[PDB]
Amino acid sequence: IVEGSDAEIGMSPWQVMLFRKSPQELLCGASLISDRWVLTAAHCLLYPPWDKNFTENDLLVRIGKHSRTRYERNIEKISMLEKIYIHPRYNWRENLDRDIALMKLKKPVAFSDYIHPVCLPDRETAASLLQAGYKGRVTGWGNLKEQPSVLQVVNLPIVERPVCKDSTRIRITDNMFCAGYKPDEGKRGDACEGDSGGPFVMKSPFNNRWYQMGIVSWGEGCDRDGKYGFYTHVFRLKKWIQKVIDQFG
């Protein structure tokens, strides 16, 4: 999303957009994990330091989009939020530990070539693919540097925890990971403001399926050398995701 390429049509059919009804504006990214469940980052709905606390009726869900601002008639679908669910131990106070949230839509969305959920990892796929050096993909309509015309895409390698901890003064947890090239590694690219809540995905070489490994959570700047994007560790909060969905559903 900071360099960054235009997506391919239907390249990320699970990519959701968090849209503000008034003033009509892009809010955040999100992902479709079922016909009636969208996955996003808690901070996209609740983040007191910036006076942010959105309720269901303040937001709309837009699925199947390619253009950032256009209303893609016959292709995108806009859904209403029945209910928001933030992780109980979401730490907005200190470091966005457990930066995750679920959204039940009021009605079930219709799948299409442009609309299709991503899988959630299992312990074995996660142990399998969450490895330093393995690249994941992140997509989003956010800033192109510290505003795109279409959905942007970028593949980033996972970074060693030490390197991660050593790049920042903020306390890193087991519930996060980081991605991004080293200053060395010639290539760059990063998430930025606006991509937040968007999915970090990987394609399993085992069954050829796409799994969401991470949620775009935070960075210090965007595409700064020696800095990395930090993503919510989805497999880790899985029991919370399961629990929430097996009950309020």
């Binding site: 391919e8 239907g10 070539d113 299709h116 991503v118 895409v153 593949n155 050829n208 399926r209 796409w210």
Partner: peptide, 27 residues
């Protein structure tokens, strides 16, 4: 679901997008 993670315009048609091999290659 049983069908998650399979794109209709790619996997389901067995078409590859332009940079997915780059991911494969790191694995």
């Amino acid at each position: 679901e049983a069908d998650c993670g399979l794109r209709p315009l790619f996997e389901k048609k067995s078409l590859e997008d332009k940079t997915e091999r780059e991911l494969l290659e790191s694995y």
